[PDB]
Amino acid sequence: AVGIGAVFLGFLGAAGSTMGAASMTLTVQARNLLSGTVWGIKQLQARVLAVERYLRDQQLLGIWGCSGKLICCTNVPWNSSWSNRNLSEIWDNMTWLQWDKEISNYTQIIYGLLEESQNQQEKNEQDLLALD
Amino acid sequence: AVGIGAVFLGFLGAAGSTMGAASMTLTVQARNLLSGTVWGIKQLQARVLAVERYLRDQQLLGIWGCSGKLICCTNVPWNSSWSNRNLSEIWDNMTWLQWDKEISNYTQIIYGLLEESQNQQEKNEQDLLALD
Amino acid sequence: AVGIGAVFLGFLGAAGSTMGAASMTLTVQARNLLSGTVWGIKQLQARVLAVERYLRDQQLLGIWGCSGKLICCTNVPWNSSWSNRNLSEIWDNMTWLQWDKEISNYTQIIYGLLEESQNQQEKNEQDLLALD
Amino acid sequence: ENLWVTVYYGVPVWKEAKTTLFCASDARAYEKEVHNVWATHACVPTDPSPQELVLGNVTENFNMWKNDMVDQMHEDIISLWDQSLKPCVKLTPLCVTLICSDATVKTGTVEEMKNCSFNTTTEIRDKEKKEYALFYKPDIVPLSETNNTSEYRLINCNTSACTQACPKVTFEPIPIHYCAPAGYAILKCNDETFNGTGPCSNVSTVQCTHGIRPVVSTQLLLNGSLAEKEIVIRSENLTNNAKIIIVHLHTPVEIVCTRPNNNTRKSVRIGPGQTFYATGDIIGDIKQAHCNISEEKWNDTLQKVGIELQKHFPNKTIKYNQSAGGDMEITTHSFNCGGEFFYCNTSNLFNGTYNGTYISTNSSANSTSTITLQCRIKQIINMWQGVGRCMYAPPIAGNITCRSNITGLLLTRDGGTNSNETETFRPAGGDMRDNWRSELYKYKVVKIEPLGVAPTRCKRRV
Amino acid sequence: INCNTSACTQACPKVTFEPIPIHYCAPAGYAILKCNDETFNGTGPCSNVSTV
Amino acid sequence: TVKTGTVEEMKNCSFNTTTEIRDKEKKEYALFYKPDIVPLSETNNTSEYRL
C-alpha cells in the first residue's frame, strides 16, 4: 500500500493484530530497541538509557534460556494458580498488549523459576559430558 | 607467519593476506572492537561510541543467526544478479578490503533476507517441538 | 541449602561455601553485574563503567565458547606446568577466592589457547557442512 | 497434556514513562543561523519524516493536562533562554542617575519617550563621558530622595541587573520537533474534536513530533496549527472557573501589527569593548503602534465560538468582556514582532455579547471595517515573571510590520449567581505552558516493554 | 593597546608555555594509518602503510 | 556602646556602601565582631579598620 517498510519497519505495527500474527514479525521491532553544552547530558543520558535498557533484557534471556533465540520453550510447567484461560482463547482473540494486562500478575515469580531451572540443566549437561 | 597473535596485533595485520587466510584469524581482531572538564565529553562520547557500535553489530548477528559464532552459513541462496564470480576467484585472489568494493552493492537487500528467514526457522522449530 | 535466593540474592553469599556448592548459585550474582549539573559525572561514568566492564567479559566468553552458557568445557588440555592438585582437593575443600589466589598464575596464557581452539572448531564445522 | 510456559522478545506492548525527549530541528536553518536562532542552537539537525501507522485496532487513552512532555519543553525553553544571554553585555554600568525631560523632538512633543542624559564610563576607567538616549516610559521610574525633580532611573535597578540580548541572536519561532529516545515511542491521536482526555480510537506512531513552534504570547495564541473539522473548546474542568479554556480555532483570523515611526539606533561605548545600543532619534513624524483585525472575520470567529461554547453552557446567551486589570504583562496581549515587544490593549476586541440565536449576518454586503488596537512597547522586560531573568531588547531601526495568522483564544469564564442567563468570558493566559500545551494535545510518550510470557503447550527437548 | 577592544587576562604565571609532545589516538573501533614511503608529496597512494 | 555600656567583643563599624544607583553612596553601619576586623593598612593608630 504502504508495506512492511512502514507497517513494522517504523514501529509496533502489529500492536493490534493478535499474538497469533504479531509473533511472526518480532525481529524488525527487536532491531529498533537499540539504535540510539549541558544539553550534551540530554544526548549522553538518552544514549546510555537505550544501551542499559537493552542489555538488562539480554541479561535475562541469557539466564533463562535458550539463549538468544527470540522464542524459547522453558520446561517450567504452569502452576494451577496461573491457569485462567484455554490456549484457543489466547492466540486467536487477544492482543499482546491486552494479554499483558492479565499475565503481568505472577510475573516476578516466573523469572525465578526460569533462572533456577537453567542451573539444573547446565549442571546436568556437565554430568552427561562427564559420564559420556 | 608471524604468530597468529601478532597477525592482528592491534588490528588488520591480515588486511593484505587474501580472505582465504584472513578469515582464519578473526578473533584476534574481534577482541579489540570493544576495548574503549568539558574534555570529559571527549572521553564519554568516545566510550559510548565504541559500545553502541559494538552492540549495533551484535544485534544483527543475533537476528540473522547462528547466533553469534563469527562464521555462519545462512541458507539464503546466492542470487544470480549478485553472481559475478566463481568461488575459485574469490577466496584465493581477493583481499577482504578489495572484496568489500564489489559486494557493497546489494548489501541492504541481503540483511532483510537473512532477518526474515530466521523467523521462519524459529517458527518451524516451534512446530517440530510441538509435533515431536 | 537454605534456598539459593536467601543465601545469594544480594551478592557473593557463597563466597565461603567451597567451589562445589558455590557453583550452583552463579546466576543471581551474574544478574547483579549490570544495574543502574557537571556533578553528574559520578552517575554517567558510574553507569558506563558497569556497561563496558560487563561487555568486556561477555566478549571473551563469546570468543572462547560455548558461547554464554555460564559453564563450558573447552577441549584445551592442561599443560604440565599448570598441574598442581588432584580434583578431590579442589572442589571439596577450596573456596573460589582461595582457588583464585593459586590459579591466578598462567591465566593470560589460558585465554589465548581458548581463543585459538575456537577458530579451529568453527573452521571444522565449515568443513563438515561443506562436505556433508 | 502438561502445559509449558514460553518467552517472547520484541513483542508490541508498552507502558507510559517520563523519559527525556530531544531535538531534532528542521535542519534547514542550520547555516550560520544555528548560533543565531534562539531556542534552536542546542537542537540536533535531523530530517524526521512522518510514519504512516495508523496501528489499526489500538484504543489508547490520552491526557493533556497531566502530560509531562509539555513540562520538559517548558524547562528546555527556560534553560535555553538563559544559555543564550550568558555571553554578552550586562547593563550594570547603565544603573546611574538619569537626568531626563520630555523628548520634544523638533518643536513637537512625543508622549511616550523620554530623552535621558547620563554619565557613561569610557573605555578608560578614569574618564567619564556625558551621553544620552531616548528611553521609553515603562522602562523609566522616578528616582527616590528628591523633590519631584527630573531625576530618573531604570526600572530594574532595585531588583536585578539586566543583560542586553546579543543583537546577533534572533528571536524567531523556528519549528521544533521532539523525539523520544530509543526504546520509547511517541503516540498521537487522530480522532477529530478531541476534548483533551479520553480514548482515541485512531492512533499513530511517529519517530518525532510535528513541527511545534515555540511562540510565546498571552490572550491569543498565534502562528499555531489549526483544528480539522470544527472549533474545539478545551478545558480541564469547565465547571471550575479557575481553569483556562483553550479555544482552538478551525479557521485562522489574520492580525497585522506595525510601528510606523522611523527610529534610529546609536551605540554607546562602555568599558573594554562592550557597546550598548539605544534609540538616538525618530527621523520622521510621530505614530501610534497598532494592530489591525477585520471586524467581519472577528464577528464570525466570535459567533462560531459562541455556538461551540453554548453546547457546554446550554440555554444561555454568551457575553465577552475585557481583561480584569493589572500590569501591562497581565492585561495586554504580548508579542515579539520583529524583535520589538508590543503590549496591545485587547479591549475592545473582546467586547459585546452575542445573542443565543447567533444571527449570522455575513452575506454579500461589504463589511470592510477593521478593529484597530493600540499598543505600548517596552525594552527592559522581565520574562516569565522572573525578575532575575530580565533582559534588554536592543532597538531596531526603521518601521516594523508583522503579519500573523491567529488564533486559539486563552479565555477564562466569569459570572456570579446574579447573571445565570449569560456568562462572562474574559481573555486570560500569560502562563507559559498553556501556549505549548495547545500543540502537544495530540502526543503521548510510551515505554516499550518488549519481553513477554505466554503458553504454547510444547516442551524444549533436553 | 587593548582598552578599546577587550580586557586581557594575565597568563597565570604558574602555567608554563612549553611544547610537551602530544600523541593523538582513535577510539575503539577506529584505527590510525600512516604512510612509510619517502618523499611523499602529501597526496596520492602510499605503497607501504602501517597501523599505530 | 549600647545604652550606657560597652560590649567587649563587637565593634560598631560604619562605612559608605554603594546604593543600587552607581552614583550615590550611602553611609551605613553594622556591628562586626573582632577577629573579623583588623586595623587599616598604615595609619597613625586611628580608629580606621578593614575586614
Automatic annotation (TrEMBL), chain E:
Glycan-linked positions: 4, 41, 48
What S-S linkages are listed for this chain? Answer: 35-46
- PTM statement from Swiss-Prot or TrEMBL: Palmitoylation of the transmembrane protein and of Env polyprotein (prior to its proteolytic cleavage) is essential for their association with host cell membrane lipid rafts. Palmitoylation is therefore required for envelope trafficking to classical lipid rafts, but not for viral replication.
Location of this chain's protein in the cell: Host cell membrane; Host endosome membrane; Virion membrane
- Write down the superkingdom of origin: Viruses
Q: Signal peptide position in this chain?
A: none
Summary of the function given for this chain in its UniProt record: Transmembrane protein gp41: Acts as a class I viral fusion protein. Under the current model, the protein has at least 3 conformational states: pre-fusion native state, pre-hairpin intermediate state, and post-fusion hairpin state. During fusion of viral and target intracellular membranes, the coiled coil regions (heptad repeats) assume a trimer-of-hairpins structure, positioning the fusion peptide in close proximity to the C-terminal region of the ectodomain. The formation of this structure appears to drive apposition and subsequent fusion of viral and target cell membranes.
Q: What is known of its domains?
A: The CD4-binding region is targeted by the antibody b12.
Give the misc comment: Inhibitors targeting HIV-1 viral envelope proteins are used as antiretroviral drugs. Attachment of virions to the cell surface via non-specific interactions and CD4 binding can be blocked by inhibitors that include cyanovirin-N, cyclotriazadisulfonamide analogs, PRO 2000, TNX 355 and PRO 542. In addition, BMS 806 can block CD4-induced conformational changes. Env interactions with the coreceptor molecules can be targeted by CCR5 antagonists including SCH-D, maraviroc (UK 427857) and aplaviroc (GW 873140), and the CXCR4 antagonist AMD 070. HIV-1 lineages are divided in three main groups, M (for Major), O (for Outlier), and N (for New, or Non-M, Non-O). The vast majority of strains found worldwide belong to the group M. Group O seems to be endemic to and largely confined to Cameroon and neighboring countries in West Central Africa, where these viruses represent a small minority of HIV-1 strains. The group N is represented by a limited number of isolates from Cameroonian persons. The group M is further subdivided in 9 clades or subtypes (A to D, F to H, J and K).
Q: How does this protein assemble?
A: The mature envelope protein (Env) consists of a homotrimer of non-covalently associated gp120-gp41 heterodimers. The resulting complex protrudes from the virus surface as a spike. There seems to be as few as 10 spikes on the average virion. Surface protein gp120 interacts with host CD4, CCR5 and CXCR4. Gp120 also interacts with the C-type lectins CD209/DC-SIGN and CLEC4M/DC-SIGNR (collectively referred to as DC-SIGN(R)). Gp120 and gp41 interact with GalCer.
Q: Which family does it belong to?
A: Belongs to the HIV-1 env protein family.
| Designated name of the protein | Envelope glycoprotein gp160
Look up and give the organism this protein is from.
Answer: Human immunodeficiency virus type 1 (HIV-1)
Its gene?
A: env
